[PDB]
Amino acid sequence: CGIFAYLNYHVPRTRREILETLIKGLQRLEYRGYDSAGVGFDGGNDKDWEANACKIQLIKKKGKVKALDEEVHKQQDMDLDIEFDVHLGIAHTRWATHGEPSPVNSHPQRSDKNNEFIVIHNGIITNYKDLKKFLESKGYDFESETDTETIAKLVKYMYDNRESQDTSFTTLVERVIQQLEGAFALVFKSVHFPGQAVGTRRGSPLLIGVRSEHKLSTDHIPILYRSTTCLFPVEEKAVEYYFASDASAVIEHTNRVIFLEDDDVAAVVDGRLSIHRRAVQTLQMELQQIMKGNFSSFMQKEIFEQPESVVNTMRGRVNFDDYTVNLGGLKDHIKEIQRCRRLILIACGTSYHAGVATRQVLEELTELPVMVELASDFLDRNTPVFRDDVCFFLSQSGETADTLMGLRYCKERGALTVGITNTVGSSISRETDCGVHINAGPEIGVASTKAYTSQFVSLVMFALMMCDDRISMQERRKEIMLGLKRLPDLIKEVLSMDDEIQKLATELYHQKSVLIMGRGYHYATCLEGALKIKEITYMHSEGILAGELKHGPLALVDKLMPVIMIIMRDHTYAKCQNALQQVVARQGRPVVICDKEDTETIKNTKRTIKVPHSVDCLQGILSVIPLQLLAFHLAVLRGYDVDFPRNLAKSVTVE
Amino acid sequence: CGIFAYLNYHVPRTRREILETLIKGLQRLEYRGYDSAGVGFDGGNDKDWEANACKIQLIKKKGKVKALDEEVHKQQDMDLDIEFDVHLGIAHTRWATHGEPSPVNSHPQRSDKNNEFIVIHNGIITNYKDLKKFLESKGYDFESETDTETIAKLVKYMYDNRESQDTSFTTLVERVIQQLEGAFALVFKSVHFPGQAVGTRRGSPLLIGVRSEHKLSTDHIPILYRSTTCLFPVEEKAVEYYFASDASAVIEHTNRVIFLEDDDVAAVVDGRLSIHRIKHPGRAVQTLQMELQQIMKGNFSSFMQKEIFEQPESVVNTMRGRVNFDDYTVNLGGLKDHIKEIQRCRRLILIACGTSYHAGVATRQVLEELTELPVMVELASDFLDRNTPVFRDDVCFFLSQSGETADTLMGLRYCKERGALTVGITNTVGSSISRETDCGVHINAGPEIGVASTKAYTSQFVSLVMFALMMCDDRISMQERRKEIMLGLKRLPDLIKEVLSMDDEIQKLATELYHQKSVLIMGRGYHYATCLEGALKIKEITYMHSEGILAGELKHGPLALVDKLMPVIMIIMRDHTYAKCQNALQQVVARQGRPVVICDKEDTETIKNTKRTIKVPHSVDCLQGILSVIPLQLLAFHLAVLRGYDVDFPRNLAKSVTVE
Ligand SMILES: CC(=O)N[C@H]1[C@@H](OP(=O)(O)OP(=O)(O)OC[C@H]2O[C@@H](n3ccc(=O)[nH]c3=O)[C@H](O)[C@@H]2O)O[C@H](CO)[C@H](O)[C@@H]1O
Ligand SMILES: CC(=O)N[C@H]1[C@@H](OP(=O)(O)OP(=O)(O)OC[C@H]2O[C@@H](n3ccc(=O)[nH]c3=O)[C@H](O)[C@@H]2O)O[C@H](CO)[C@H](O)[C@@H]1O
Ligand SMILES: O=C[C@H](O)[C@@H](O)[C@H](O)[C@H](O)COP(=O)(O)O
Ligand SMILES: O=C[C@H](O)[C@@H](O)[C@H](O)[C@H](O)COP(=O)(O)O
Ligand SMILES: N[C@@H](CCC(=O)O)C(=O)O
Ligand SMILES: [Mg+2]
Ligand SMILES: [Mg+2]
């Protein structure tokens, strides 16, 4: 779910310029939740914008943001020509994990049939049931089934029982959050406080952007406790704020945000931002990083840009002249990491596959036990963790709920915690003792592509550090590093087969299932490949450990069942050939992903995807890219959108 | 694939009785699958059995043992009434690997057109190419495309080039195995050694049963290297020996067996059994607690159905003598001399393949809880590929119903080389994994004759839980938890009967999925293994694409498969993950999914809001996995029966037949 609001203080904007800014802001956040959307602005059609702040209008509709963008326009009541010198508008896109994605369950929620208080919420209230019964007894009627409505009906209860006639909007919100349990990122708007916005958070992101041609009064807003305190233009009033749950919706307008913190109750009053209970900083992000460029989809871009993101992951960290690896984020801890006795990799989904993909080389080069855990199961079992465990947390977004709770679980037990993240300032990167930012750039597509290969590369670089003092492993280190030097170009070679992959997708788009088989370094490849095909093509694809065929799953193979096998020139080659012979003996007709030089396999197999050879512990990067491409093409053939798969969105930050 | 030889020494038997005993032996080995069978015996119709010892007759045929039995009695020139005071008959069921199924490629393989030597073989001779080239150059013509025939021709080569006229049958076979490469179990017979048998093995099971109304000379056969030294009846000669590759072919005659080991050469000479070796070590004569009834279908139409519905009994047999509900104590006799060391180790590693691996996943959480040690569960094939680090203070468990799975066995030797304490959780006495582990527990579920693991899974489950209960029997703070679990085991057999009484409800579900091509089985926590195991059963038995999905992973991708057309089975039990399982259910339903829910009888909320629910009784949280997987065992069974499949037919065949 995404949050976005636009507050133009003494910056005249027509009602069309404001609505096109709220929609354009949700488009930047649509990848976090596209089951429904809504906006909240001021109604009425009075030339004097002052006589319109008392009327709130809510336009909410089911579907992606494009369904709402059309619902806003072509209306017979809203005149899109009114000039507003001061106006506040809030928007929201929702990931409806429960119930129906109806307009009533979408945000903003309202407190009454006259819209005196409207709020947009990201997160969950763990006690909204108790709050709902208390509010129903005092005379408040509920309409929606969401936990967000208990926040709108409650901020009005704190307003109907205030002590003074002019209690600040902050005091009302402060009394609400004290009754709310769980996490939340709220943005309020009320007719009683025209133009005044309030943004409080607790375990959920929420920043405030600012733009103004004038000089700002400070760059370090001092947090307060219940002229030289608020952020505002000095001489004039022309200022534009941008509340948002992510920086992508604000970079297009400005690169000056104020990241809030837990329980920081920000408030814009008279166009002055003040925090209650900061640092006005610049964003290290360019707009081109969140643009599709000349690609028809973000996922396609992010796949074909893996030659570059692999390079950025190694930038300033790998020196091929002298074969040295330095991860700055682990300089002050690499010594203590080496005195520990076990590695534990904890993550969900594709990030968990990255740990599977690198488990073997980590075991080889560190010689420590390595355990790879799915976060949700790690928590269910109350896995034993000890003071001399080193726990890695792989999370592209750095906000995954299960991975984050696993982190706090391990910290409570004294383990050294290491983060492998792609989002600076995220919960997981902050709360870990150390870590590495994989520096892959923003990932917009729901299905992770470059985050997997960048996590892969990052864990390999770590392994290379852990053994840089072993004489016996010096050559092995050079071998791997020479592989990394050649990886970007070998990735380009794999991408050049895009057309050949597309041809093969036309021979499979109609099937209902596909088994992907591999072992060793390519177990993770067949798990991740199966996950991608599931996620965006909706075919029933399943990864099967090749060595496990003889123990049951081989019974499913016949001349009709599609099969993809991965056979690379590493130490499991012969065992992979036996698995291939078993599939053939069952009349299977598999597609084999093999090395170009593997002439024996290429002759005896009709359909082969010939990838270039690399180091065994890097080949997994080259063998998974074809399956990223296959899933992409299969989705296009089946008429699906690769960037917006059904039933979910990107980053699981709630239950 | 199956070996059986019957040696009656001074126990008069007619030719009919001998042949019926060979046929009956192969009938006990058919469940292992085969494409042909054959028998070898003494031909000739001379009323004196002593003159018929130089005429070996072979009857081999492609097809089932039934057809062989018909071919046996369909012999016009054979007199079935001759009485033999001493005789050796050998029999074999073949799973063709080298050479296509045929009479010529069936066993026994002969050494020449006069059948001077014959041999039956389980396995593959890797270097059979070089061996065939050599013997051909020395002037030995082959007639079959089997690797086995090289064994028969080679033993005659050693005989043809013996130094003295009285070199022992053992010596010849010793010189043969020293030239063979690969895996083999063998039984030899020859006109030049009438009444004698030689059996040897390398990488393939071979055992010897013995029966005699007289006192036997010893229960521990010493090894002889290249009276008091061998096994024999004392006061009289009468004795019967049974060579076999599986105890199922011996248990009806005797329960006293000797388990041969790699490169042992066992020989019966003048009715006395000795075990020679080229390398006081000996081989024990032990008593098997196996009964013929345990390998018969009885009133059940299939072994799968029997082994599912008898799980109330097998669970009881797994616990017998090991749990004391009178004072809440657990005693696994097999761990008495090692439990102290195990408690001083620092990590548990469970290593297994397939369903046996699922048993580790199903008991990982309770092992962690009750031992407080790290518990790592590893698929044997991947454990080996990665060269997993193993240390001297690791306790490595090896779960295996058969005790012969190659990868699990190689993982066992991997861990022994690194000094780890090794523990077996097995269901086959005398199997490789039982012998080679430092210690272990025989789960005592009875032989598993069905193709798919049913009672073995639940008995492995119970056995690992019992081990967890031993590991914490000294912790005051855990006494209550141990009592709760042991009262759950006390009630488990009756709870299983309750679940089995819902068979009708499971059939209804089978017809609903009759036409379906896929089904997602979703669960978490204690029931992650239930999903994986249920998905493997339905794949193996029903041949539809069933897949287990960890419920907590739905929102990370796999949930995209849910729509109004995808069948789904969800497991929601009354444990600590109940709320998270409800969340997963709301996620599915929100996307038009209409799942079938396996839940507790008294979960009224889910029963009303879900159309079809399989309602199992509630047990301890760490035991519910046994009750929640049984409806999936039955589901797989009924779907296959509906689709015309033979649940007792393997199908899963290895690589094709090398024709050469
Ligand atoms: C964010 C930042 O200023 N990065 C700078 C840092 O990159 P580096 O490559 O040296 O470090 P990094 O970006 O990987 O990590 C930055 C800091 O965050 C910590 N960390 C990182 C990831 C995680 O999940 N958890 C965690 O605690 C890490 O321990 C370090 O203290 O130095 C570079 C020059 O060499 C550049 O100046 C980079 O801009
Ligand atoms: C096989 C056998 O005759 N067991 C007898 C033994 O059972 P316990 O129930 O006393 O033995 P159970 O078969 O576990 O173990 C028998 C022996 O085999 C060993 N073992 C077992 C399984 C494995 O995978 N690895 C391994 O090393 C185990 O350490 C022990 O030395 O005593 C009983 C009486 O109390 C009965 O007389 C049982 O028949
Ligand atoms: O293609 C699938 C998605 O990428 C998904 O599986 C993702 O990997 C997880 O939701 C974990 O997300 P993070 O890596 O951001 O924590
Ligand atoms: O139904 C499943 C099968 O039984 C199969 O998966 C079996 O579990 C493995 O082949 C391991 O066999 P063992 O338990 O004999 O090692
Ligand atoms: N390799 C031998 C024996 C195989 C077996 O039945 O185990 C053959 O194919 O004849
Ligand atoms: Mg940090
Ligand atoms: Mg043993």
Coordinates of N, CA and C in Angstrom, one line a residue, chain A residues 1-6 19 21-41 58-66 68-69 72 89-97 102-109 118-124 146-148 184-187 204-206 243-245 249 653-654:
Chain A
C1 N 0.8 -1.2 0.0 CA 0.0 0.0 0.0 C 0.9 1.3 0.0
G2 N 0.4 2.3 -0.7 CA 1.2 3.5 -0.9 C 0.4 4.7 -0.4
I3 N 1.1 5.7 0.1 CA 0.6 7.0 0.6 C 1.2 8.1 -0.2
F4 N 0.3 9.1 -0.5 CA 0.8 10.3 -1.2 C -0.2 11.4 -1.0
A5 N 0.3 12.6 -0.8 CA -0.5 13.8 -0.6 C 0.2 15.0 -1.1
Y6 N -0.6 16.1 -1.5 CA 0.0 17.3 -2.1 C -0.6 18.5 -1.4
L19 N -5.4 17.1 -8.8 CA -5.8 15.8 -9.0 C -4.8 15.0 -9.9
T21 N -1.7 15.5 -9.9 CA -0.6 15.3 -9.0 C -0.8 14.1 -8.0
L22 N -2.0 14.0 -7.5 CA -2.4 12.9 -6.7 C -2.3 11.6 -7.4
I23 N -2.9 11.5 -8.6 CA -2.8 10.3 -9.5 C -1.4 10.0 -9.8
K24 N -0.6 11.0 -10.3 CA 0.8 10.8 -10.7 C 1.6 10.3 -9.5
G25 N 1.2 10.7 -8.3 CA 1.9 10.2 -7.1 C 1.6 8.7 -6.8
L26 N 0.3 8.4 -7.0 CA -0.1 7.0 -6.8 C 0.6 6.1 -7.9
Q27 N 0.7 6.6 -9.1 CA 1.4 5.8 -10.1 C 2.8 5.4 -9.7
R28 N 3.5 6.4 -9.1 CA 4.8 6.1 -8.6 C 4.8 5.0 -7.5
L29 N 3.7 4.8 -6.8 CA 3.6 3.9 -5.7 C 2.7 2.7 -6.0
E30 N 2.2 2.6 -7.2 CA 1.2 1.6 -7.6 C 1.8 0.2 -7.3
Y31 N 3.1 0.0 -7.5 CA 3.7 -1.3 -7.4 C 3.6 -1.9 -6.0
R32 N 3.3 -1.0 -5.0 CA 3.2 -1.5 -3.6 C 1.7 -1.9 -3.3
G33 N 0.8 -1.8 -4.2 CA -0.6 -2.2 -4.0 C -1.5 -1.6 -5.0
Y34 N -2.1 -2.5 -5.9 CA -2.9 -2.0 -7.0 C -4.2 -2.7 -7.1
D35 N -4.8 -3.0 -5.9 CA -6.1 -3.6 -5.9 C -7.2 -2.6 -5.8
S36 N -6.9 -1.4 -5.4 CA -7.9 -0.3 -5.4 C -7.1 1.0 -5.1
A37 N -7.8 2.2 -5.2 CA -7.2 3.5 -5.1 C -8.3 4.5 -4.7
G38 N -7.8 5.6 -4.2 CA -8.7 6.7 -3.8 C -8.0 8.0 -3.6
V39 N -8.7 9.1 -3.6 CA -8.2 10.4 -3.3 C -9.2 11.2 -2.5
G40 N -8.6 12.2 -1.8 CA -9.4 13.0 -0.9 C -9.1 14.5 -1.1
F41 N -10.0 15.3 -1.6 CA -9.7 16.7 -1.9 C -10.9 17.5 -1.4
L58 N -14.5 12.6 -1.7 CA -13.8 11.4 -1.7 C -14.2 10.6 -3.0
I59 N -13.2 10.3 -3.8 CA -13.4 9.6 -5.1 C -12.5 8.3 -4.9
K60 N -13.2 7.2 -4.7 CA -12.5 5.9 -4.5 C -13.1 4.9 -5.5
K61 N -12.3 4.0 -6.1 CA -12.8 3.1 -7.0 C -11.9 1.8 -7.0
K62 N -12.5 0.7 -7.3 CA -11.7 -0.6 -7.4 C -10.9 -0.7 -8.7
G63 N -9.8 -1.4 -8.6 CA -8.9 -1.6 -9.7 C -7.6 -0.8 -9.4
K64 N -6.8 -0.8 -10.5 CA -5.5 -0.1 -10.4 C -5.8 1.4 -10.4
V65 N -4.7 2.2 -10.5 CA -4.8 3.7 -10.4 C -5.5 4.2 -11.7
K66 N -5.3 3.4 -12.8 CA -5.9 3.8 -14.1 C -7.4 3.8 -14.0
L68 N -9.1 4.6 -11.3 CA -9.5 5.8 -10.5 C -9.2 7.1 -11.3
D69 N -8.1 7.1 -12.1 CA -7.9 8.3 -12.9 C -9.0 8.6 -13.9
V72 N -12.1 9.9 -11.6 CA -12.0 11.3 -11.2 C -12.5 12.2 -12.4
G89 N -4.5 17.7 -0.4 CA -5.1 16.6 -1.0 C -4.4 15.3 -0.6
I90 N -5.1 14.3 -0.2 CA -4.5 13.0 0.2 C -5.0 11.9 -0.8
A91 N -4.1 10.9 -1.0 CA -4.4 9.8 -1.9 C -3.8 8.5 -1.3
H92 N -4.2 7.4 -1.9 CA -3.8 6.1 -1.4 C -4.1 5.0 -2.4
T93 N -3.2 4.0 -2.5 CA -3.4 2.8 -3.2 C -3.3 1.6 -2.3
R94 N -4.2 0.7 -2.4 CA -4.4 -0.3 -1.4 C -4.1 -1.7 -1.9
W95 N -3.4 -2.5 -1.1 CA -3.2 -4.0 -1.4 C -4.2 -4.7 -0.5
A96 N -5.4 -5.1 -1.1 CA -6.4 -5.7 -0.4 C -6.1 -7.2 -0.2
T97 N -5.4 -7.5 0.9 CA -5.0 -8.9 1.2 C -6.2 -9.6 1.7
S102 N -13.3 -3.3 -2.5 CA -14.4 -2.4 -2.9 C -14.0 -1.0 -2.6
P103 N -14.7 0.0 -3.2 CA -14.5 1.4 -2.9 C -14.7 1.7 -1.4
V104 N -15.6 1.0 -0.7 CA -15.8 1.3 0.7 C -14.6 0.9 1.6
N105 N -13.9 -0.2 1.2 CA -12.8 -0.6 1.9 C -11.5 0.1 1.5
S106 N -11.5 0.9 0.4 CA -10.4 1.7 0.0 C -10.3 2.9 0.9
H107 N -9.1 3.6 0.8 CA -8.8 4.8 1.5 C -8.9 6.0 0.6
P108 N -9.1 7.2 1.2 CA -9.2 7.6 2.6 C -10.5 7.1 3.3
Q109 N -10.4 6.7 4.5 CA -11.5 6.5 5.3 C -12.1 7.8 5.9
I118 N -10.6 12.7 7.5 CA -10.3 11.6 6.6 C -8.8 11.3 6.7
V119 N -8.5 10.0 6.7 CA -7.2 9.5 7.0 C -6.8 8.4 6.0
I120 N -5.6 8.3 5.7 CA -5.0 7.3 4.8 C -4.0 6.5 5.7
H121 N -4.0 5.2 5.6 CA -3.3 4.3 6.6 C -2.5 3.3 5.8
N122 N -1.3 3.0 6.2 CA -0.4 1.9 5.8 C 0.0 1.1 7.0
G123 N -0.5 -0.1 7.1 CA -0.1 -1.0 8.2 C -1.3 -1.7 8.7
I124 N -1.3 -2.1 10.0 CA -2.4 -2.9 10.6 C -2.5 -2.4 12.1
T146 N -12.6 -2.5 7.3 CA -11.1 -2.3 7.4 C -10.8 -1.8 8.8
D147 N -9.6 -2.0 9.3 CA -9.1 -1.5 10.5 C -8.7 0.0 10.5
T148 N -8.7 0.6 9.3 CA -8.4 2.0 9.1 C -9.6 2.9 9.6
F184 N 1.7 1.7 11.8 CA 0.8 2.5 11.1 C 1.6 3.7 10.5
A185 N 1.2 4.2 9.4 CA 1.7 5.5 8.8 C 0.5 6.3 8.3
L186 N 0.2 7.3 9.1 CA -1.1 8.0 8.9 C -0.9 9.4 8.3
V187 N -1.8 9.9 7.6 CA -1.9 11.3 7.1 C -3.3 11.7 7.2
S204 N 6.3 2.0 10.2 CA 5.9 2.1 8.8 C 6.5 3.4 8.2
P205 N 7.1 3.3 7.0 CA 7.7 4.5 6.4 C 6.7 5.7 6.2
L206 N 7.3 6.9 6.3 CA 6.5 8.1 6.0 C 7.4 9.3 6.1
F243 N 3.8 14.7 1.3 CA 3.8 13.5 2.1 C 3.7 12.2 1.3
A244 N 4.5 11.2 1.7 CA 4.5 10.0 0.9 C 5.2 8.9 1.7
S245 N 4.8 7.7 1.4 CA 5.4 6.5 2.1 C 6.6 6.0 1.4
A249 N 7.7 8.7 -5.2 CA 6.6 9.6 -5.5 C 6.9 11.1 -5.3
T653 N 5.1 -6.2 3.9 CA 5.4 -5.5 5.2 C 4.3 -5.7 6.3
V654 N 3.3 -6.5 6.0 CA 2.3 -6.8 7.0 C 2.1 -8.3 7.2

